[PDB]
Amino acid sequence: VRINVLRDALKSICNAQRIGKKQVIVRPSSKVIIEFLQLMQKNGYISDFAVVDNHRSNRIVVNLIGRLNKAGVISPRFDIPANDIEKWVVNLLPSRLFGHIILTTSQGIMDHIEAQHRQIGGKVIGYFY
Amino acid sequence: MARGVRKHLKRLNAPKHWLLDKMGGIWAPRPTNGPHGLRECIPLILILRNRLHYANTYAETSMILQDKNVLIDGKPRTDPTFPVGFMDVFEIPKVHKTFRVLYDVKGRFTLVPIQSNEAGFKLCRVQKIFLGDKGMPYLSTHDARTIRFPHPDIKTNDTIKINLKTGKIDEWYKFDIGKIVMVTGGRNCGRIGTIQAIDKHMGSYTMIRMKDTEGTEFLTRLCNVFVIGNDSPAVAIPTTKGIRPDIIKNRELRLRSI
């Protein structure tokens, strides 16, 4: 059965971007998907998107610009102590200069840079570069 | 499982704030029972030998104590292992030196020289009010001193001023918000501050919040909060008014002294 909607959405996004398309459709929308896409947009990776209301698990349409290189999720959301982020950065990201790691905290969904700025920790959701 | 009480003390198992050297020897002095317990006291010989440097060995300290050259609250003590504690009086008449035992910001015992106007008394913290034989009310203090027939207005955790000459109360300080206090245990030993909040948790410890004069705020449990007067201290305090510096500031001080 369907479990992780975000994983399906990200896989579809990468599949479409691989063959140089311009628009993708994701079926089951959700708040977490919307925040993930908002962060991606803010960092300049996927331009804009729209949500279509059908009264049943709204759909969503996104527009690409051939900048995204890889996106993914960590299924069992482990807890990241505020001082245990550099290990994950080294393990997951190509470099310490570019790339982002998404965490959910009591203060909301934020990039790992922001969490390092505020010296707090939380749970890991995904990553992209 | 030992068959009886313990009489020795290994050097490594001794309290840290005594500052004994690791290689000084295998053993350390074992304080005898008295006004203060093992973990909130310090033996007399350590003061007489490793601090004032008046003696170089155990035998010299024993001879000095036998000659009755040291007074502790006006009563000569001949025990090299007599425990000394907070808010004690340490006067040596033969050299006209009088000190009061207090805590430094770092959390160690210190000797603060005093004057004669305030050297005839001591401050005591009341921990218990109980009925003794025949229903006569009593009270006990942190230095193991019991007083009969006290004023009803005195309650627990208050502070009491007893004259050493006779041993009678003259006045007391209530435990309330806005009274200067001194911390006698934990991570905040030696700090001075003023009470700002009192939060009581049913069936568990009561927490006391006080603010330092500079503006710092810290928390500690009521078991080691000692009132030392109203607004201003009743007794003398070390040069620094209970202000703990940070590591950087302490390093700057060390470099300046070097």
Partner: protein
Amino acid sequence: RRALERAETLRKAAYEMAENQHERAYHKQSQIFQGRFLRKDNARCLRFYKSIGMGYHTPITAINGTYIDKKCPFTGNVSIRGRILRGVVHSAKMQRSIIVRRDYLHFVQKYKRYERRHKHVAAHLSPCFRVKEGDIVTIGECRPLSKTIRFNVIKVEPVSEAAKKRFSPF
């Protein structure tokens, strides 16, 4: 008039008990001095009860009941002190005792995951409380009452039967 009805009801319970010859001994409340029941006026209290404190209130059943239990926290001679815990009822087959189920989590650092664990805790249940399997109870600590019992029930929150057994840490 309300107090008068209570005293009569309490008085009957004492005299119908003396007609239960099957019992080996006569069970009584230690605090009350037998002899007050010979007074026709209601000038004396016939039943003893206390408040355990900690914000819990005494059930009306204990105050108006007609039962004797020296291990009850309200009408007996025990005191509550220490830790207060919660759990669900696992079995209620003994005379005045039950088995309580507690659930918690254990973390394993190597695998960065958890385990679900449970323990069984036996407690004393006073007649003032009615309990079936699955209900939530609050237990307070007391002195050793038996080989395995060191807790006493203080509060019962009913749960519907047929409900799904679920992992419920408390």
